[PDB]
């Protein structure tokens, strides 16, 4: 059944190198869903952060339609190994490092719906660059993004669009694996740009990270007040015993330095 349906699709002349045809010659429209699993290692020094997500791409390839209207056949057939299919050569423009998960069987899923609609799902670990602004460092908010776009195909061949409903989703155990920050807001936007090689379509998801204050309250502010307050208890020592005053004023000043360091 499934194995036969797949066989039928590729027994004919099918070229995974050839872009899927369109009715008006328009570009292949790729709908994108994105599921963040974990956001970790938010490096302020190198201004980057890591994040593992599930990319989900969906386009139409009439050449792959087997059931068409179907209603007598399976809704979709799972694409098995050894069958090539044209896929959007998407990459992450602001990715500095990236890995696919391949433990046991590779972590991918490809479905070929009867009408020719393809679903593509893949786990990807990324290390993205996120320029940060520390003007209010102790109490700041940063905005980190993931950019997704085609590398070779221009605006005439491939166009990205965020899924209509819930384009960006978060796994339930994300905020719990992110102890130092609070993921307050997320946004789903377009970053299509015009370059020297052409105009390339591009999506951009953005998360907003609010830095947790409890740490800085306890490790910075509290202990500094407690340090300044100590320098005051020397105002109550007799003006004759200066050794005591200097010892206080100097030790609290030195400690202040260390703390800041």
């Amino acid at each position, epitope marked *: 059944s499934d194995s036969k349906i797949l066989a039928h699709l590729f027994t004919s002349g099918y070229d995974f190198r050839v872009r899927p045809p369109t009715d*008006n010659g328009g570009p292949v429209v790729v709908s994108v869903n994105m599921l963040l699993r974990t956001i970790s290692k938010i490096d302020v020094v190198n201004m980057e952060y890591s994040a593992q997500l599930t990319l989900r791409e969906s386009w139409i390839d009439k050449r792959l339609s087997y059931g068409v209207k179907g209603d007598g056949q399976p809704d979709f057939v799972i694409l098995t190994v050894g069958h090539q299919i044209w896929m959007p050569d998407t990459f992450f423009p602001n990715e500095k490092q990236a890995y696919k998960h391949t433990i046991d069987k590779p972590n991918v899923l490809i479905r070929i719906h009867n009408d020719g609609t393809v679903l593509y799902s893949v786990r990807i670990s990324l290390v993205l660059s996120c320029p940060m602004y520390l003007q209010y460092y102790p109490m700041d908010v940063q905005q980190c993004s993931i950019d997704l776009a085609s590398y070779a195909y221009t*605006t005439k061949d491939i166009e990205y669009l965020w899924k209509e409903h819930s384009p960006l989703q978060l796994k339930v155990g994300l905020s719990s694996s992110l102890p130092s920050f609070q993921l307050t807001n997320t946004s789903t936007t377009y970053c*299509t*740009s015009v370059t020297n090689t052409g*105009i390339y379509s591009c999506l951009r998801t953005t998360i907003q990270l609010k830095r947790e204050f409890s740490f800085y309250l306890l490790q910075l502010y509290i202990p500094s007040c407690m340090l300044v307050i100590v320098s005051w208890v020397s105002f109550w020592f007799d003006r004759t015993a200066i050794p005591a005053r200097v010892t206080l004023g100097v030790t609290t000043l030195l400690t202040m330095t260390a703390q800041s360091a």
Partner: antibody
Amino acid sequence: EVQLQQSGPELVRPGASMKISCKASGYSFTGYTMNWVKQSHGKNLEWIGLINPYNGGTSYNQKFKGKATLTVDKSSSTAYMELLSLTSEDSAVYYCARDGDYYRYGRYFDYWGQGTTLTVSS
Amino acid sequence: QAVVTQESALTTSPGETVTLTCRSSTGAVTTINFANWVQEKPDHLFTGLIGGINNRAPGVPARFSGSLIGDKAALTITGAQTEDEAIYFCALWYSNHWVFGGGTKLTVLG
């Protein structure tokens, strides 16, 4: 307030070529890409092409491929358009229209210029 | 090739709600057409209204709004004003270039 001021009207003989300007002010010039639109009596509005000031990059309407040459002078915040092998059909009003997005292509128009009237007659 | 079609002219009174439409010849206007709307006041004054995905130009009044009613791009002015009387061009994006419509001459009765 942003402003796009284009060069004055021009009269040129067929076969010649002239270049109209579009001086931008009131915004970071290199952040928004510029469109060029041609409004002729004979037809509707036509989209000639666009140029990204920051990038130098250009993209022309297949129709005007070789007829127009978009350039940009960062120092003076000016966008220029060359028109080669001018003929009767090139007699029109040429507008320049800024793109909406900041350091990215948004595919939507902000501000236009007052237009430049080009007359090619013999 | 592809051609864009608009109402030759429309009429409306101050306060009413008028709707201009933009039609594609190749088929239904989809999101990848990035339907744009441009206004032309007398003396060659062009300005953008709507465009791209669902964004608008700086300062475009709240009464202006875009949508994909039926199978063509729409521009709805809820609460028309006197100054709203102008020529409205819609532009569709076909693969790699823009194609403008004939323009609709909206008249606000006086």
